[PDB]
Amino acid sequence: SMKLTIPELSLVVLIGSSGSGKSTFAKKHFKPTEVISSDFCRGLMSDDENDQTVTGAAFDVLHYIVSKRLQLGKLTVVDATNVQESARKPLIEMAKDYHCFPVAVVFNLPEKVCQERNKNRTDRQVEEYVIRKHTQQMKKSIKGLQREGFRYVYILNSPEEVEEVVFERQP
Amino acid sequence: SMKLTIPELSLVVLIGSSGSGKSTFAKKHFKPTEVISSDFCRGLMSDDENDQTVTGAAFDVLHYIVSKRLQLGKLTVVDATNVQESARKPLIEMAKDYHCFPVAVVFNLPEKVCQERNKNRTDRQVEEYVIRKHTQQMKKSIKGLQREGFRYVYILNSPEEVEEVVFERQP
């Protein structure tokens, strides 16, 4: 296995393109209540699946819910693309505010893996350029993650590595 | 039938004891995505139903989600007991803030009806003293509701009146 050590007081930030398997991974490794997704928050604002008109509100709600959980000192996983620095920074800042350790888990999968999984999705699908963009943005992000303030940076480079993952929580 | 008017843009505040049928009424009359409940928000903070350290943050989460919806111009129902003035105050403020109409719907049922439904619930139950206190709080709230800032105050005085309610979203 590939052991990823995280402290009990963690803000786990999943980073990866659409189709990179973030939500799948999240369900495999964490309790439902520990996972907060952007899709979920969007759904609180609108019953249209992936309503793009409520994006800012959805991310405000996500930030709010995360901050409240961290405030109670509860481990939280942020399930969103998080490929932009502007999306990661408030998570880092929030984590630092409430004495929690930000952890980055990067799905550094080749674009074609994500493009493939996308086309076979039964829930929702995006155009190819969305995934091409996300992947470029993710790849550009990797080098500077530690410096951005992530205490632990775990880069998963292939599906096989993603499969082998096991978290060890240290309380 | 008892026709109650609610503007398209309303904050609908359900007021009643545990066991008074708030959630059942909400499901009958409104879309699932229109209804934000305290149980749901509590669930976002913890998977332990009996955890009380959570309630302040769940309160804060309920208000925030509701306020973002109101900001987006979306009719929202607050499915919580709302029998304390302190609980209602921030709801009124947000409705004013985002120019929504605050509407109170009060489940003015006898304590016995709520106790007996509580005993027969298979989903989750509260202790009888909780219902006694809610009902007293609800009764004490009625006279002041219009003065609190509710623009429409609808008091349902019996199960038969609750059953006959039909909402008209005219304005």
Ligand SMILES: Nc1ncnc2c1ncn2[C@@H]1O[C@H](COP(=O)(O)OP(=O)(O)OP(=O)(O)O)[C@@H](O)[C@H]1O
């Ligand atoms: N390890 C895997 N191997 C093969 N297919 C997978 C794997 N993980 C996920 N998939 C499939 O790929 C699709 C996308 O996965 P998932 O929804 O978890 O992506 P995501 O990163 O959450 O995307 P989004 O950012 O759009 O929410 C799903 O249909 C899923 O079943």
Ligand SMILES: Nc1ncnc2c1ncn2[C@@H]1O[C@H](COP(=O)(O)OP(=O)(O)OP(=O)(O)O)[C@@H](O)[C@H]1O
């Ligand atoms: N009109 C009704 N006649 C008979 N039983 C009812 C009626 N409305 C609701 N009930 C029953 O009473 C129980 C409690 O109802 P419900 O959960 O809607 O109450 P609530 O006010 O949402 O309670 P809480 O505040 O604890 O969430 C449920 O088992 C429900 O099926």
Ligand SMILES: [Mg+2]
């Ligand atoms: Mg997902």
Ligand SMILES: [Mg+2]
């Ligand atoms: Mg209820």
Ligand code: NA
């Ligand atoms: Na009104």
